[PDB]
Each structure stands twice: as C-alpha cells, then as structure tokens.
Design a protein around this ligand. Sequence first.
Ligand SMILES: CSc1ccc(C2CC2)cc1CC(=O)N1CCC[C@H](C(N)=O)C1
Ligand SMILES: [Zn+2]
Length: 139
Amino acid sequence: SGAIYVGNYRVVNRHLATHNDWANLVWEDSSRDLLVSSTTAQGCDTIARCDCQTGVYYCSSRRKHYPVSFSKPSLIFVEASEYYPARYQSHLMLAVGHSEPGDCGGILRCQHGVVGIVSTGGNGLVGFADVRDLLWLDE
Ligand SMILES: CSc1ccc(C2CC2)cc1CC(=O)N1CCC[C@H](C(N)=O)C1
Ligand SMILES: [Zn+2]
C-alpha cells in the first residue's frame, strides 16, 4: 500500500485502487499501473521534474528506506498476475533492491522530490511507476 498526495490529487497503483478512487477518477492507465483520483483536501507532496537515476525508496516489508540506483522509464515486460495479464508495462524503472507484493505504493524520492511509486519487483529487483512526466499534477 501507499499513495502520492499532490494538491487535489491522490496517485495510487491502479491494481490497488478503491471505490472512492474510481467514483472520483481523473485519469487511469493499466499499462503504467497508475490511477489518479480527486480529493477535497490540499496535498503537499512535491513531484520531481527531473531525470535523476539515484534516489531513496520506502520498503514496508523491511520497515526501511533504501538508497537505489534506478533505470530510465521504459517498456519492461511484467509476467502475468491476478491483476493484469502478461504484458510490457510502460514508464517503469528498475533497481537492484528488496521488494515484496505488499510493497506496491511505497514512494521513491530524489533531491527534487517524488519520482514514483513501487509497482513491480522480484528476483532481487524492484520496479517504480514513474510520475515525473505527469505535469498536470501541479496545475
Ligand atoms: C513490489 S510487487 C512484487 C515484488 C516482488 C515479487 C516477488 C519476487 C516475485 C512480486 C511482485 C509482484 C508484481 O510485480 N506484480 C503484482 C501486482 C501487479 C504488478 C504490476 N504493476 O503489474 C506486478
Ligand atoms: Zn530528481
């Protein structure tokens, strides 16, 4: 679990979305595993506008923050699961680091702010759903 709260938006994994999120849908994308919904309260997370390749992510399965070197956003194949069939997930960034299924939603941050959220993982790797390109989150 985990979400990004910027202004009047809530950014979560599309596969972990709730009824409120779908009843107040702004935008959703299965290939990115992102869903953005409406909120009345004014969130304060700063989204990064950058091309950083080093950051810090939160791992709830270890109760720790970890520094990671991560890849550039790309179409990386994700094996079929209970939420999605086998496919390439766009805007995904990989890193060598610990990851477990309940880790989805954990924030990734650099000096510029929020980069993305834990979306995939396994075999000693962790994948992040990038949000730096969603310029409408601030406006
Ligand atoms: C941090 S999630 C994770 C971590 C470790 C593992 C274990 C080492 C295998 C597996 C996973 C699950 C996984 O990657 N997905 C299931 C939920 C939907 C995700 C998607 N965005 O398509 C894909
Ligand atoms: Zn940055």
